[PDB]
Amino acid sequence: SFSGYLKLTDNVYIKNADIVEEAKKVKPTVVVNAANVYLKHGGGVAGALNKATNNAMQVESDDYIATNGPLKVGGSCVLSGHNLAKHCLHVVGPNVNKGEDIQLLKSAYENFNQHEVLLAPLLSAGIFGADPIHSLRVCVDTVRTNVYLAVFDKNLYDKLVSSFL
Ligand SMILES: Cn1ccc(C(=O)Nc2cccc(C(=O)O)c2)n1
């Protein structure tokens, strides 16, 4: 089960950890991927999760896209968790580096409410370009289910905890 997490609110928890390593240890029911609309798991959390599945997540995702077309920014899809989790909830947060509307971050987090417990990264943080402090605030104000946030970067983790209102 989840260990070493700091409780932020009644339902949001945070830990300075590699989400891939957290997933392999916990094997949660749901691991959230920081996905793009095309499910092209190239870099950041998506690239790391996909590489941990030996590219099985990408093969599965390409078949999903061939059948269904791309996701919407703010949307999600449930696919296999492979060796990491029972399921992977691929959530598309807005990518600020691609000029996408930051207001879609709340819609993206609403996808977590369909799952009772999730292991997740901060949406739109990292290479997506949004302020991680803002992402954590939208997370605690939007997600009502139990979310265990894994923040890879130690310095960012410390900044997030020390600035949490
Ligand atoms: C105001 N602003 C926008 C972006 C940032 C910012 O510090 N982003 C950032 C930088 C380094 C790592 C990570 C991460 O999620 O791993 C995120 N600050």
From Swiss-Prot:
Signal peptide: none
Modulation of this protein's activity: Inhibited in vitro by GRL-0617.
Localization (cell): Host endoplasmic reticulum membrane
Membrane-topology descriptor: Multi-pass membrane protein
Catalytic reaction annotation: Thiol-dependent hydrolysis of ester, thioester, amide, peptide and isopeptide bonds formed by the C-terminal Gly of ubiquitin (a 76-residue protein attached to proteins as an intracellular targeting signal)
Residues annotated as domain Macro: 1-165
Quaternary context: May form homohexamers. Interacts with N protein.
Function: Responsible for the cleavages located at the N-terminus of the replicase polyprotein. Participates together with nsp4 in the assembly of virally-induced cytoplasmic double-membrane vesicles necessary for viral replication. Antagonizes innate immune induction of type I interferon by blocking the phosphorylation, dimerization and subsequent nuclear translocation of host IRF3. Also prevents host NF-kappa-B signaling. In addition, PL-PRO possesses a deubiquitinating/deISGylating activity and processes both 'Lys-48'- and 'Lys-63'-linked polyubiquitin chains from cellular substrates.
Name of the featured protein: Papain-like protease nsp3
Encoding gene per record: rep
Stretch of the intact protein here: 1027 to 1191 of 7096
